[PDB]
Structures are given as C-alpha cells and as structure tokens.
C-alpha cells in the first residue's frame, strides 16, 4: 500500500502565504512527474502544478507566479510554496502521480486544508 502523507495548510489572510509538503511512500516521487491538485468543496480535483523529472514546472494559469512547485528526490517529497494567496485557492490539496485523476482506482491521501480568509 502506498501512502501519501500531506502538510502545511492553514487559515490565512488574502495576500498570505503558506508552504505544502507531500511524502509518498515507494519510488512514485524519485522516478516520475508529480502534481500537486485542489478540490473545492463539491468541485472535482484540478491540477494546480505540475513537476517533472527534468526540473520542468508547469502551473495552471491563475497559480503562475504565485505557486511555485519543487520536489526532493530523496526525501521522497513534493512541495508547493503558495504566496500571494486569494480566496478562490481554498480547497482541500493533494499531491500525486501526474495523470492519477484518469484512473477511476487512485489512491489519495487526506489532503491538507487551505482557506484564505477577508
């Protein structure tokens, strides 16, 4: 079984920041891109950043410049600093294997809880 262990939520003013981090059990981080995706209550999981093995980054557009998306081969994790936060970024985040939302079977973690608050 594989586990996928999120952190670095929080409750925070517009403009705030906060930094997730995601430990993935097995070689899913080492060998293979990894996403960091956001579900908002009642909404379908999104991709939000995307990290590749290259180095590449790609990011949604309304997190570009914002987010920025890393990971560490060797501590098996994946981060995504989140600045400038706005109210539309709540939701519940997760990180995964890029591509793991076609599979109906993915298994997820619990996430951690953004909000961004007036």
């Known amino acids: 079984q594989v586990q996928l262990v999120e952190s670095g939520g929080g409750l925070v003013q517009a403009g705030g920041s906060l930094r997730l981090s995601c430990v993935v059990s097995?070689?899913?981080?080492?060998?293979?891109?990894m996403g960091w995706y956001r579900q908002a209550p009642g909404k379908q999981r999104e991709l939000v950043a995307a990290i590749y093995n290259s180095g590449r980054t790609n990011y949604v557009d309304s997190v570009k410049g914002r987010f920025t998306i890393s990971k560490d081969n060797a501590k098996k994790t994946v981060y995504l600093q989140m600045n400038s936060l706005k109210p539309e970024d709540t939701a519940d985040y997760f990180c995964?294997?890029?591509?793991?939302?076609?599979?109906?079977?993915?298994?997820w973690g619990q996430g951690t809880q953004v909000t961004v608050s007036s």
């Open positions: 995964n294997l890029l591509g793991a939302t076609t599979m109906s079977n993915a298994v």
């Open positions: 097995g070689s899913a981080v080492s060998d293979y891109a």
